[PDB]
Amino acid sequence: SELLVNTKSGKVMGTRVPVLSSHISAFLGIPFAEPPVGNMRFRRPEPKKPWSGVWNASTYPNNCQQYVDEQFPGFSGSEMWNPNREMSEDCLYLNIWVPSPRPKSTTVMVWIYGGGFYSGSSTLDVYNGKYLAYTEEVVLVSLSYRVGAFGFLALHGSQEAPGNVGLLDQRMALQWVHDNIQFFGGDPKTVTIFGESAGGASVGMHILSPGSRDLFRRAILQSGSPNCPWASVSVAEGRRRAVELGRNLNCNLNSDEELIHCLREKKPQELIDVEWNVLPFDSIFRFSFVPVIDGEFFPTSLESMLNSGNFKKTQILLGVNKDEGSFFLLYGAPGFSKDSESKISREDFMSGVKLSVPHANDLGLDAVTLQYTDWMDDNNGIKNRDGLDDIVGDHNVICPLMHFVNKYTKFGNGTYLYFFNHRASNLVWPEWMGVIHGYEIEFVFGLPLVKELNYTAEEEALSRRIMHYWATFAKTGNPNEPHSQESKWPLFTTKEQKFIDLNTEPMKVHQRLRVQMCVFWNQFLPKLLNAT
Amino acid sequence: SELLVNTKSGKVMGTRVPVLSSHISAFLGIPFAEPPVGNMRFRRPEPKKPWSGVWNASTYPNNCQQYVDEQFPGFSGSEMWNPNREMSEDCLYLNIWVPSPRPKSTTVMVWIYGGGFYSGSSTLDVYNGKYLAYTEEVVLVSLSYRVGAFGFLALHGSQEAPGNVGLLDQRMALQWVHDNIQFFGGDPKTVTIFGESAGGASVGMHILSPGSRDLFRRAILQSGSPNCPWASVSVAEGRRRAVELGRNLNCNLNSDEELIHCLREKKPQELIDVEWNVLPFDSIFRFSFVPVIDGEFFPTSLESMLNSGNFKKTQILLGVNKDEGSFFLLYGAPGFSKDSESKISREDFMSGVKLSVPHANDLGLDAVTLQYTDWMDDNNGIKNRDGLDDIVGDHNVICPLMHFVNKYTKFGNGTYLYFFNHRASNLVWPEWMGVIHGYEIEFVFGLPLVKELNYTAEEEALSRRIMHYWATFAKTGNPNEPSKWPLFTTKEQKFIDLNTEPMKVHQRLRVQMCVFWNQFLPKLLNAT
């Protein structure tokens, strides 16, 4: 039967689901590892041991333990991102959507959810993989990885809490895909890992980590990059935070063994409630437990690896949104409300840069300020708001991604760059927030194809070509369909630096994406802060 | 007669000079100090000893010893600034233009030529005061002062070469005016000192210096302020330069006096031939011997004085030109030519910026570059040319003056700021230089009123309103005569455009760039 599959470790029984007046197979909650519970909390993932009988894969699994957001209870805009299942430490599962007539050996795309390495679920409505699996005829997989302290507490030197175990969870599901996707009609030599935000950084980190390299063919990064200021810490900082988490819990701090034995006894929520307490400064777009440059998952520093071409050389498709930082300013900066135009005053502008570039001396702060202020009209609330928005988006997403794209292209085999600037007609967030962090996702997954969601006809078309670019890239390594009458998305080269706009207007090609500001962030400020 | 005046130190006789089909009186080459020659080289000036008989003041005096520009032999554009009279260390004279018939006790304006303190003359054609004196019925006086080593060699502590003597020359000119201008029909109580460039910085220095404050009423600064980076040096830097000057001429360096005596022996030209050698950095818009903050003429640091408000509180009218830096880049930077559009490659731009901010470290240069570069079009030869032009003009003239204007206004009794951006229809320099440093002067001096100079009627109009603004401001402390030229206030920061079109009132003159040059970069270099 189409729904019953003999995987290496056991039988899996999926379920038939409707998709736009049709059907496709869905295998939900398939486990790829032993439950990281008990004395396993904080440790490297272990492979799921074989089971007898048939594993019921007709329902989504649990979401991993995480800080649930409660800023706007009941508001769909914020809660669509929260865990929609029971949060359990037993959460290492992956889901697969296989087109009906099971494909013989087709393209595979593995989705890696993002959420600052502190949150995220594979089960959210926006990650329903049926539309893309059905429409583009690909085997769509969404995996899951431990987040926060569970997946990232790093006491470098300890084999109980080495750090980067969340990244290792991802690697294991990728291995699982490599060892079993062939039984679902997937081609393990043609898999594309794609993710957004922490999911976008994770993808880049797999392109850098030797132990992950041969588990996938190509890569797609959305609004995320391995070198993002928030995507990783030094092993020192990692250890520091691990000890501070333990201090915050009255933990015996004698040795790593004792700190870990303590933390392992606390109930999950106990760790979450103190999670943000370990950060260095009051900030936005900064998360407590994230990947550590250990010299194992990451042989050396990310920049050293980038300069030496010590990474997987394949094709990559990647991009950013127009207003990546508004989501964060709304939550942590003064003057920002979802119920108002949020015209920011000079006073709150200052307060906001301080929160956005937490690790910058006053000379730094002045530079960022001078760089984004119109001193001819510095009391303009609209400009101050948009100025600060750009600051958070440029510093945390766009420039880090642009630095990575320029480094990678030197050694890569094909790079395609996009700029998502479409504001959805049915957006629930206020207009000032613009094209929000995470909002190209519903288009990558094809939610506009379902009528009852109210997207315009032009939004259905945008989604369809975005999904086609993604699937065609995953299939061939070039998002453009051979000999088509459509507009060409050109290769991004270190010389021409071309990229395109992803929106309703007829495609347009641009060059040097936000160079001016990114020379500032990627070149000047680092040098200014280095000279101290 | 009207051409024979009894001054306090002796008689003097001028001459009747024609002006626009009318006449006015001219007293030229009036000595106001003892010839600072021989032993008196580098020494403070000494008042002019009285004389018997009448002093012939019918012709212009010698010009002070200075580096003569030979970049364009015979080109009027640069030749018009070179000494047009025979040079001589005996050059402390002043000129006066008195409207005819002689006024009773009218407004007096005293011009202070500018040329980086290393050059300048009171006899240039663009300084002919007979037009302004006549058109606005004012007594116009042009002074002179020592430049280069002769006026600013500085061995602080010594008394044979104390430094700032060139300024004391200026102060003595003003003291002379104070004591005598009433004999020519001018009110010593309503004297305005105005000057351009290094002259403008001097005006500002006499506003700051306690010993100069009481000798004048108001002030006008044209493209220069006392805090300009090229305008002064510490006692140590002055001292360093003085000694290196000696090292260059194989002078004994064992002590202040031996050095000074050795330098006194040398001929004027020997000193000038090695004048530039003392500069600490290869650069542009930098001069060797300039004023020194000695704690005498200047009590404390300029900034310290500006902040505490330790300076003459009165009204000031000042401004700057559209492209102050073109002249400098043309003479010392690669890519710039007088016979081409001078499009600047990225590589020549990089050179240009290092020559422009000689004191900045790499981080600083980087910052200046980021600030003026269009990273989406960095090989645009025009954007790069203009960018450099703006760097030089903003760093050396505009922003130091905007810092002076905002500080002064805090205690002042009335500021009036302008932005001159008209390019003479008959400019002999290439179009890319724009509104060049020093080319507002001909308007202030009404040359556009003499037809043989081929300016346009619309320009004669600009000249006249400008001369009226200057004179009306001189006489009343207000350029307007009851759209009007609005007062500059730290709240609205308004200023006007000075050109042929109808007056426009703007606000916050080059605030973006100047926040960079006055606040950011300083704090950056200071830290690093």
Ligand SMILES: C[As+](C)(C)CCO[C@@H](c1ccccc1[N+](=O)O)C(F)(F)F
């Ligand atoms: C496709 As998402 C990486 C779950 C867009 C928002 O998520 C941000 C965020 C930013 C600012 C405030 C709140 C949140 N949030 O609740 O998720 C974060 F943190 F997950 F990255």
Ligand SMILES: C[As+](C)(C)CCO[C@@H](c1ccccc1[N+](=O)O)C(F)(F)F
């Ligand atoms: C004890 As808290 C006021 C949940 C520390 C971080 O707060 C952030 C934040 C809060 C919730 C999700 C994501 C973010 N973030 O990415 O910065 C902000 F924005 F509220 F300050």
Ligand SMILES: C[As+](C)(C)CCO[C@@H](c1ccccc1[N+](=O)O)C(F)(F)F
């Ligand atoms: C040995 As030389 C070539 C007389 C040092 C300065 O030269 C300047 C210069 C020359 C003449 C007048 C002013 C300037 N200046 O302000 O920099 C420039 F431009 F040639 F490099």
Ligand SMILES: C[As+](C)(C)CCO[C@@H](c1ccccc1[N+](=O)O)C(F)(F)F
């Ligand atoms: C009204 As003027 C202050 C005598 C014109 C500009 O003069 C500059 C200059 C700048 C670059 C090259 C040559 C010169 N120059 O011969 O005067 C300097 F140096 F005098 F200020």
Ligand SMILES: *[C@@H]1O[C@H](CO)[C@@H](O)[C@H](O)[C@H]1NC(C)=O
């Ligand atoms: C799998 O479990 C779900 C939920 O309990 C149920 O709806 C489905 O029928 C189950 N499959 C079978 C028949 O085991």
Ligand SMILES: *[C@@H]1O[C@H](CO)[C@@H](O)[C@H](O)[C@H]1NC(C)=O
């Ligand atoms: C990718 O690699 C192939 C074979 O090594 C080469 O022919 C092609 O030029 C490369 N493509 C790019 C754009 O790097």
Ligand SMILES: *[C@@H]1O[C@H](CO)[C@@H](O)[C@H](O)[C@H]1NC(C)=O
């Ligand atoms: C005044 O000086 C001029 C020029 O030096 C000379 O030609 C003239 O004869 C002199 N007049 C008298 C009588 O001193």
Ligand SMILES: *[C@@H]1O[C@H](CO)[C@@H](O)[C@H](O)[C@H]1NC(C)=O
């Ligand atoms: C100048 O000072 C006088 C006397 O105190 C004062 O009345 C006048 O308002 C001041 N003018 C300005 C514009 O500061």
